[PDB]
Design a protein around this ligand. Structure first.
Ligand SMILES: [Mg+2]
Ligand SMILES: [Mg+2]
Ligand SMILES: [Mg+2]
Ligand SMILES: [Mg+2]
Ligand SMILES: [Mg+2]
Ligand SMILES: [Mg+2]
Ligand SMILES: [Mg+2]
Ligand SMILES: [Mg+2]
Ligand SMILES: [Mg+2]
Ligand SMILES: [Mg+2]
Ligand SMILES: [Mg+2]
Ligand SMILES: [Mg+2]
Length: 122
RNA sequence: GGGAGCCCUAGCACAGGUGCUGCAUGGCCGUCGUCAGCUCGUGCCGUGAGGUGUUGGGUUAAGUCCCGCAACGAGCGCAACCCCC
């Protein structure tokens, strides 16, 4: 179910345009298309998934990030399917560092959301 | 015979100056220019002066608006609120 599901839809991405560092993950190079190791993937999915579960187990929230076309929706859906913020459009500069500022903008969204369905608008 | 203004002389303390300096000033005015510009708060960059935002594409009478974007917002301006036709 693992390697089988992943092997039939995962790995074999990029070509020459790699990154020295990302070498301990590379498996082979058949067809100028670097082939990442899946047996080492499950190894990280283990630790990764383990940390994710422990985070949500203690009531932890995760902010998914995915703008690249092929992922926009996948993120929006997979995100809501769990209930947690997520920016698939354009990652504004300061979303984290400038939270107070950026986040403060949210208040406006709520005000307008209620003001639009109010009377004053009449 | 004392006194209030008040009027006078004489003396005292003071008044007056369109006399100087706009190169000690306030206030008001002109001017670039009704040009569309000039900045700030936090964030990020740089050792620093500073930068970004406000560089770019299209659009407008316009930093007007739109689309982009490590920036997200805001202020003095633009516009609108005032008068005339
Ligand atoms: Mg003089
Ligand atoms: Mg003078
Ligand atoms: Mg002068
Ligand atoms: Mg003067
Ligand atoms: Mg004008
Ligand atoms: Mg330098
Ligand atoms: Mg610094
Ligand atoms: Mg600055
Ligand atoms: Mg700044
Ligand atoms: Mg600047
Ligand atoms: Mg403006
Ligand atoms: Mg901009």
């Amino acid at each position: 179910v693992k390697e089988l599901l992943e092997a039939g839809v995962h790995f074999g991405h990029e070509r020459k345009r790699w990154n020295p560092k990302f070498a301990r993950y590379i498996y082979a190079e058949r067809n100028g298309i670097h082939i990442i190791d899946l047996q080492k993937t499950m190894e990280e999915l283990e630790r990764t998934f383990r940390f994710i579960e422990d985070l949500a187990m203690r009531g932890g929230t995760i902010l998914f990030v995915g703008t690249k076309k092929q992922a926009q929706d996948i993120v929006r859906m997979e995100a809501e399917r769990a209930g947690m913020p997520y920016v698939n459009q354009r990652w504004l500069g300061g979303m984290l560092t400038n939270f107070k500022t950026i986040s403060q903008r949210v208040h406006r969204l709520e005000e307008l959301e209620a003001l639009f369905a109010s009377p004053e608008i009449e």
